Amino acid sequence: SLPFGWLIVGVALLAVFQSASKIITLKKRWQLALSKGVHFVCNLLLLFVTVYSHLLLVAAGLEAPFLYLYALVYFLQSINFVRIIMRLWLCWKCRSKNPLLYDANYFLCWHTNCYDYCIPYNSVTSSIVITSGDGEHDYQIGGYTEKWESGVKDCVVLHSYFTSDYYQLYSTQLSTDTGVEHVTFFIYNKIVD
Amino acid sequence: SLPFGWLIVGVALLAVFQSASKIITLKKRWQLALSKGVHFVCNLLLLFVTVYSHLLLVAAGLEAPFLYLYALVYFLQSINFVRIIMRLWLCWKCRSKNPLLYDANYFLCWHTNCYDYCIPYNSVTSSIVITSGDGEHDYQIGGYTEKWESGVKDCVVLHSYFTSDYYQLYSTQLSTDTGVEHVTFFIYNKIVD
């Protein structure tokens, strides 16, 4: 017969890992990588505990209201599986590892000789302001920051799952125009022609 | 005696709600509100299923390696509980409902006569560029967007749990300077004096 106690220890281990995932502070790079690993462990434990309960009900007699309920579990996990492999396809698309870490909607990216940059972004917004600080030089858009290696390009691309939009550097803002020393603003406009 | 089957149906209902929370697209306001509600349901089901398992082990004899495991579950849930009431304190602090919805690190906010604005933000960054579009007028910082009611202020505040930082509008950028029509850039510098 199938034993009962393995389901109980799986629930307790799932509770430990879920309550630990919910209080990660998500501030630095290693904290984001740690929380993504703990999220993967949580979904593995949830998948294990639900197939274990379905096997128990197979041995005891599984009802039809429970048939479509466990069917709902497996269907939503299949949709989640195709989302993860699309995230890996997006990770290949931008050629940087930030699609697995940062969990945003869109990603702004341009290619250099030392780095293939990518910075998180929330929507298509018709104008993007990249602010590079003086000296550490680092490009930031809305708080998310990536360190400077090579230099700026004219056309940057906003990537997502199924879309891609291009922006051209229309004009740049020095410190003479604004008065804010030690920064420089690059202003991009969306090209549709 | 305590029945075994309620733990199984609680596990199955937790699986449905967890697999449904993981594939919300998080693009509009009602989708963010829906996913936060489903997250609350998930933690209620997890709390219920772990105290049910602890009660069954109390009836059967609970081992000391399992004593500290369920102690770990309850301790991490206490840390999660004080985090939620701090999110509500932050929701009272900037006087808008976006701390419950958007799940970012810092929030930029200024008060008007028709609206108390608040826009998500990731870190303290020494310069903030708020871009208001022409006509719908809407203030956006990095993709997150809020509709325009009254007008702009000189001093905006970046709020968090324990911190608060102020930024002054150093100079503004029209369409004459950049060439990007139908937008206007407000450039803020951090005040330390």
3-state secondary structure of A26: coil
DSSP A34-91: HHHHHHHHHHHHHHHHHHHHHHHHHHH---HHHHHHHHHHHHHHHHHHHHHHHHHHHH
Angle at CA of residue B19, ends B15 and B21, nearest 5°: 120
| A171 vs B178: CA distance, rounded Å | 5
Report the residue of A49, A50, A66, A160 to disrupt the B interface, i.e. the one with the largest count of B CBs within 10 Å. Answer: A50
| B183 vs B138: CA distance, rounded Å | 10
CA neighbor of A132 nearest in space, from A121, A114, A145:
A145
Determine the distance in angstroms separating the CA of A145 from the nearest CA of chain B, rounded to an integer: 9
Please give the single-letter amino acid code of residue A67. Answer: L
Report the residue of B180, B183, B185 to disrupt the A interface, i.e. the one with the largest count of A CBs within 10 Å. Answer: B180
| A4 vs B53: CA distance, rounded Å | 12
| B8 vs B48: CA distance, rounded Å | 12
Instruction: Inform me whether the C-beta atom of residue B51 falls under 8 Å from chain A C-beta atoms.
Output: no
Please give the single-letter amino acid code of residue B92. Answer: W
Contact status, residue B106 vs residue B159, Cβ threshold 8 Å? yes
What Cα–Cα distance (Å) separates residue B43 from each residue in A12, B40, B131? 14, 5, 38
Handedness of CA A38, A39, A42, A44 (dihedral sign): negative
Residues of B in contact with A50 (CB under 8 A): 11-12, 15
Nearest chain A residue to B124 by CA distance is A143
Q: How far apart are the first and last CA of chain A?
A: 69
CB contact (8 A) between residue B171 and residue A189: no
CA neighbor of A179 nearest in space, from B181, B169, B140, B185:
B169
Q: Which residues have CB under 8 Å from A8's CB, separation 6+?
A: B7, B53, B56, B57
Residues of A in contact with B140 (CB under 8 A): 125
| A8 vs B8: CA distance, rounded Å | 10
Angle at CA of residue B191, ends B186 and B193, nearest 5°: 150
| A92 vs A87: CA distance, rounded Å | 9
User: Chain-centre distance of CA B175, in angstroms?
Assistant: 34
Interhelix angle B29-60/B64-93, rounded to 10 degrees, is 150
Residue keyed to tokens 């991009």: A188
| B61 vs B55: CA distance, rounded Å | 10
Contact status, residue A110 vs residue A153, Cβ threshold 8 Å? yes
Please give the single-letter amino acid code of residue B140. Answer: Q
Residue A107's DSSP bridge partners are A120, A159
Query: What resolution in angstroms does the PDB record give?
Result: 2.9
Residues of B in contact with A105 (CB under 8 A): 26-27, 143
Cα dihedral B173, B177, B179, B180, rounded to 10, equals: -10
CA neighbor of B110 nearest in space, from B146, B145, B158, B143:
B158
| B104 vs B121: CA distance, rounded Å | 6
Residue keyed to tokens 């560029």: B129
Angle at CA of residue B28, ends B24 and B34, nearest 5°: 50
Window 119-158 of B: residues touching A by CB (8 A cutoff) are 121-123, 125-127, 129, 131, 133, 140-145
Q: Which helix (H) or strand (E) holds B97?
A: none
CA neighbor of A53 nearest in space, from B190, B193, B12:
B12
| B88 vs A129: CA distance, rounded Å | 32
3-state secondary structure of A5: helix
Of B26, B50, B129, the CB nearest to A11: B50
DSSP designation for B24: -
| A21 vs A32: CA distance, rounded Å | 11
Tokens of B26: 């998080």
Contact status, residue B119 vs residue B146, Cβ threshold 8 Å? yes
Tokens of B79: 């840390």
Of B20, B70, B141, the CB nearest to A12: B70
Tokens of A175: 């410190």
Q: Which helix (H) or strand (E) holds B104?
A: none
Starting from the edge strand earliest in sequence, which strands make up the sheet with B119-121, in order?
B119-121, B106-109, B155-159, B164-173, B183-190, B127-133, B138-141, B144-147
Residues of B in contact with A70 (CB under 8 A): 12
What's the alpha-carbon Rg for chain B, to the nearest Å? 23
Please give the single-letter amino acid code of residue A167. Answer: Y
Determine the distance in angstroms separating the CA of B117 from the nearest CA of chain A, rounded to an integer: 17
Instruction: Inform me whether the C-beta atom of residue B76 falls under 8 Å from chain A C-beta atoms.
Output: yes
Residues of A in contact with B57 (CB under 8 A): 8
